[PDB]
Amino acid sequence: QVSLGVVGIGKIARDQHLPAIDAEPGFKLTACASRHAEVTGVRNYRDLRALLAAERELDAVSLCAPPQVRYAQARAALEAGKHVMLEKPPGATLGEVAVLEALARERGLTLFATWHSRCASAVEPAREWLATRAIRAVQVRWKEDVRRWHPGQQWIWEPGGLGVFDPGINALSIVTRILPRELVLREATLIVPSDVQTPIAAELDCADTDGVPVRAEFDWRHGPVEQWEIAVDTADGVLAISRGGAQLSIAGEPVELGPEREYPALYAHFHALIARGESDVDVRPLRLVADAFLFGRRVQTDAFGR
Amino acid sequence: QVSLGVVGIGKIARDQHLPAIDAEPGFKLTACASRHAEVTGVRNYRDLRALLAAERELDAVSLCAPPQVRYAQARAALEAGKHVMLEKPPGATLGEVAVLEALARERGLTLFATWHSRCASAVEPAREWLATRAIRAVQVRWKEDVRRWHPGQQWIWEPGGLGVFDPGINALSIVTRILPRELVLREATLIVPSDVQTPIAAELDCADTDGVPVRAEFDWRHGPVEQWEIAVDTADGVLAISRGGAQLSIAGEPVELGPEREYPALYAHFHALIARGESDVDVRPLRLVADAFLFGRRVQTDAFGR
Ligand SMILES: NC(=O)c1ccc[n+]([C@@H]2O[C@H](COP(=O)([O-])OP(=O)(O)OC[C@H]3O[C@@H](n4cnc5c(N)ncnc54)[C@H](OP(=O)(O)O)[C@@H]3O)[C@@H](O)[C@H]2O)c1
Ligand SMILES: NC(=O)c1ccc[n+]([C@@H]2O[C@H](COP(=O)([O-])OP(=O)(O)OC[C@H]3O[C@@H](n4cnc5c(N)ncnc54)[C@H](OP(=O)(O)O)[C@@H]3O)[C@@H](O)[C@H]2O)c1
Numbered sequence: 001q002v003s004l005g006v007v008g009i010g011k012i013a014r015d016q017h018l019p020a021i022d023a024e025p026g027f028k029l030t031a032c033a034s035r036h037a038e039v040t041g042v043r044n045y046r047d048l049r050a051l052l053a054a055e056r057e058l059d060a061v062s063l064c065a066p067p068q069v070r071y072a073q074a075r076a077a078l079e080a081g082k083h084v085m086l087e088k089p090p091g092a093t094l095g096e097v098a099v100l101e102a103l104a105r106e107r108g109l110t111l112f113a114t115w116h117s118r119c120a121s122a123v124e125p126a127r128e129w130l131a132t133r134a135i136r137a138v139q140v141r142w143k144e145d146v147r148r149w150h151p152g153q154q155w156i157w158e159p160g161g162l163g164v165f166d167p168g169i170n171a172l173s174i175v176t177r178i179l180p181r182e183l184v185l186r187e188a189t190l191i192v193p194s195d196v197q198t199p200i201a202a203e204l205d206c207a208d209t210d211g212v213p214v215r216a217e218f219d220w221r222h223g224p225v226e227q228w229e230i231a232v233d234t235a236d237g238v239l240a241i242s243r244g245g246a247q248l249s250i251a252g253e254p255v256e257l258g259p260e261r262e263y264p265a266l267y268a269h270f271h272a273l274i275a276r277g278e279s280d281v282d283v284r285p286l287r288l289v290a291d292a293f294l295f296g297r298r299v300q301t302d303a304f305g306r
Numbered sequence: 307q308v309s310l311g312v313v314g315i316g317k318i319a320r321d322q323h324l325p326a327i328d329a330e331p332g333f334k335l336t337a338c339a340s341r342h343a344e345v346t347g348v349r350n351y352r353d354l355r356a357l358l359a360a361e362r363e364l365d366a367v368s369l370c371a372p373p374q375v376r377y378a379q380a381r382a383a384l385e386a387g388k389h390v391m392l393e394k395p396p397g398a399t400l401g402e403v404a405v406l407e408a409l410a411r412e413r414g415l416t417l418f419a420t421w422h423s424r425c426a427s428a429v430e431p432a433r434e435w436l437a438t439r440a441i442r443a444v445q446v447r448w449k450e451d452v453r454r455w456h457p458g459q460q461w462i463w464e465p466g467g468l469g470v471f472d473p474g475i476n477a478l479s480i481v482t483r484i485l486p487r488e489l490v491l492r493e494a495t496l497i498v499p500s501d502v503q504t505p506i507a508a509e510l511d512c513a514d515t516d517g518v519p520v521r522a523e524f525d526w527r528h529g530p531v532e533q534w535e536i537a538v539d540t541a542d543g544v545l546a547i548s549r550g551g552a553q554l555s556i557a558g559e560p561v562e563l564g565p566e567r568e569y570p571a572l573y574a575h576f577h578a579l580i581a582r583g584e585s586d587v588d589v590r591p592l593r594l595v596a597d598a599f600l601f602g603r604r605v606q607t608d609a610f611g612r
Contacts, residue, residue, distance in 0.1 A: 093490065093597035096491075099488055182408070184405055185399050287400055293599045295398050296465060
């Protein structure tokens with residue numbers, strides 16, 4: 001049993017992390033760090049530094065806080081000799097993560113940048129279907145009401161919070177896993193409300209290296225349709241991922257899929273990486289987003305307001 | 307003796323590229339591509355695709371055009387079997403540069419992402435002196451009036467053109483060569499005029515992996531003093547680079563250096579890279595600018611004039 005600590009007991013820690021952990025006998029939940037929350041049945045600390053000082057035999061740490069505080073938490077846990085699992089996005093910058101990964105490597109420690117939507121049930125069968133085939137186009141639609149799905153949340157609007165790319169990077173994490181060739185950004189448009197620091201919507205125009213166009217529209221504004229779809233057009237028909245990876249159809253037939261166990265799968269993968277002395281740090285979805293922030297044209301819109 | 311083609315005969319090609327090539331026996335200037343200019347004594351083409359179709363025995367290509375068109379040109383040159391030298395920034399995005407690097411390896415071709423300010427005479431002496439001293443803090447000041455130094459240039463203000471980071475990235479390419487440890491961006495502020503798509507001023511708060519603060523101020527606005535300095539505080543005194551890397555002082559005492567031969571040295575390195583069969587693609591200065599566009603707070607400022 002690998003001794004596990006968890007940092008930042010908020011929405012996703014209680015909804016997904018704690019249940020999955022308790023159902024991984026491969027980890028044993030030992031301690032938690034959170035400023036304004038406590039988890040019963042374990043030792044609890046206010047911050048990770050006080051956890052690391054007191055939990056000398058702790059093996060591993062999993063970061064469930066916002067991405068603007070991940071680098072300092074990941075760095076401290078690796079200093080103290082712990083394996084590290086990162087919620088997504090793996091950091092607020094690319095430079096952060098490169099340093100974390102060199103640091104983990106240097107100490108033989110496991111660093112896991114997680115992309116939970118990559119563990120959706122449609123991803124692996126769609127990747128197998130798409131390996132050989134000739135692809136013609138990809139389109140992504142990722143639209144939801146931020147007020148309905150992130151009520152009152154602030155850090156999403158602060159520097160390093162990604163804005164609409166916080167769920168949008170999920171779709172990019174699927175796209176980059178299911179297509180075989182790499183993506184280049186050709187053009188992007190970011191749409192930023194004048195009272196926040198991150199985009200509320202974006203359109204992305206990419207191409208993979210054989211020139212296959214990949215288009216994506218991200219939108220958090222009130223709208224008629226909430227959708228989480230990726231549609232790959234091929235000589236052999238259309239592969240259509242919907243419901244955020246939980247549903248798949250190939251050429252117009254449903255594919256039977258095992259039920260959704262994203263976070264169970266991630267923790268099983270984190271436990272296997274520790275067992276093999278390995279790391280899994282794929283930052284390509286973040287790199288694409290960075291390219292959008294670096295290369296995209298930016299447009300001002302009406303205030304998000306209250 | 308390498309057969310060479312130059313694309314984009316504008317200001318830097320006239321000012322530095324062509325006279326460096328002419329004084330480098332390693333290269334024979336064979337052909338130029340430019341839509342609105344012609345070079346004497348060589349075959350000239352309106353664009354690179356035409357040049358590649360008639361220049362069969364050509365070996366290598368140097369790209370001197372704006373960054374937004376660098377990818378399509380470099381990929382074509384690499385796909386036609388030519389070594390490629392990139393002006394800086396090596397691209398408008400990180401993803402496009404990773405694609406070029408991978409493509410040149412697959413073909414065995416040399417790809418050289420150049421940074422002319424890394425060849426300034428102060429850089430290597432400064433790198434040598436700093437390699438194992440105790441560094442306390444680093445300060446960077448890169449300030450000049452764009453109306454004086456870049457008059458009538460417009461691609462600097464378009465997406466992918468970097469704005470004040472076009473000269474700013476030069477400083478970043480020196481800091482990143484002379485400091486032994488990697489940089490993490492902790493905070494950035496970008497000052498963007500309402501009528502352009504790139505910033506005219508920026509502040510970066512960085513730290514190296516030992517915790518050394520690295521601060522940089524970039525400014526293209528009207529101000530008191532032009533300056534292009536990198537000052538490094540150590541327990542053994544201050545190392546100060548000034549005049550864009552042409553001047554170096556150590557503990558108040560100047561150090562005397564080779565005359566400025568930045569592009570002669572860039573082209574000597576390119577030839578040597580082709581001799582060895584290697585590439586040189588250091589995108590760290592660009593990755594850091596991308597972290598600032600991603601993570602930085604943005605402030606709209608008054609219209610620049612255009
Ligand atoms: N549907 C989802 O929500 C979802 C799904 C998948 C992945 N994620 C990812 O998981 C992360 C956050 O989603 P969320 O549920 O965790 O939002 P969250 O509830 O706002 O953040 C989780 C907790 O981190 C702590 N926190 C906030 N600021 C902190 C700071 N400066 N220092 C230390 N701790 C701080 C807070 O707990 P304390 O106040 O007690 O310290 C917060 O309760 C994000 O990276 C997100 O993209 C979310
Ligand atoms: N000037 C400096 O201070 C300086 C110094 C060192 C390095 N650099 C770097 O060198 C690169 C070029 O800089 P520059 O100062 O020479 O800019 P520039 O004066 O605009 O010259 C670039 C030339 O590329 C061609 N061009 C412009 N748009 C093009 C397009 N869509 N497609 C094809 N060709 C196009 C143009 O030649 P045609 O119109 O004839 O086709 C232009 O004359 C930049 O990446 C810059 O960062 C600049």
